[PDB]
Amino acid sequence: KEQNGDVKEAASILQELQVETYGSMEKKERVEFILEQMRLCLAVKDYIRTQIISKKINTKFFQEENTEKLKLKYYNLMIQLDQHEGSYLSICKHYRAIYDTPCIQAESEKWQQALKSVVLYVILAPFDNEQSDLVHRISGDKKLEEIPKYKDLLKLFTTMELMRWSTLVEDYGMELRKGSLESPATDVFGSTEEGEKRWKDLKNRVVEHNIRIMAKYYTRITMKRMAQLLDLSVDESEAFLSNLVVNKTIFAKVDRLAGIINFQRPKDPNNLLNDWSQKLNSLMSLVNKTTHLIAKEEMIHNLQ
């Protein structure tokens, strides 16, 4: 039916597959017959069908008792469809499992695939929780420093300094130019719409990210002037605010006259904020004054 040209039987085989995959336990046969799910799926391109069948796909698996050989390839061919149907975060549990791939096969071709896609899920990782722990998993690797993008990952790690992306332009350009490592950048950009969407959402993600970083700082960086230093319009900044409302910007202080924003200085309840601050400050001061004082009192005894 593949070469026949009839896609009307896809619903049939994918319907019967659900019946054939239940009522018995098959380790070898199920894995070999599970490719039929994502086989005609490329022709069908149905969202709800994909919603039913990674759900019925990845439901139970751990490590062993599955051999076709070639497993890592199919694994790379699995959630890529969920990436095509999905957007970004869908690959978080996808590209994090590829660390065992260079162990099974030659590490020569892993530079253009594994080490290329290993930064993807850690870049697209949520800024809430996973960003904290997941960055320590990729760390410690000796091949990590070999990657020219190590400095970029270092800039995306913590304490990001404000810089122009125009310098990164030729970096990404030559990243497309050289075929030594992370070669399939053209394959990533193979789709005209997908590449632009991913790029724009990447720039949006980092331009949100640095704001989230400076959000903790009370230094009042005056984003009105920052927009002038970055040479950008305030309209797309208001769009970034439209992203901020679902990014939970709900706690802040703004002004009608000027454009100065305040992420701090609340109503300041006397029994909460200044109370807690005075608590920690005075207590720490007292105990610290208590320690090194008598510590020195013990130190001067060594002179006698």
């Binding site: 605010l241 901020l244 409302v245 910007t249 709900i250 802040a252 202080k253 703004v254 002004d255 009608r256």
Partner: protein
């Protein structure tokens, strides 16, 4: 909607409901901001808006 029954009150209740949703949506993150700028997106008069709000 001229021959519409008494349920028109419920229709206006749903309209005011969605209106309340929008009002607690866009205004909430703004402590103090221009009214014309925030009404520029909804492109409607600030009269009925101010009336419902004050109400």
């Amino acid at each position: 909607l001229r021959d519409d029954p008494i349920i028109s009150t419920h229709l206006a209740k749903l309209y005011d409901n969605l209106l309340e949703q929008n009002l607690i949506r866009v205004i909430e993150p703004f402590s103090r901001v221009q009214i014309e700028h925030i009404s520029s997106l909804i492109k409607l008069s600030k009269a009925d808006v101010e009336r419902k709000l004050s109400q």
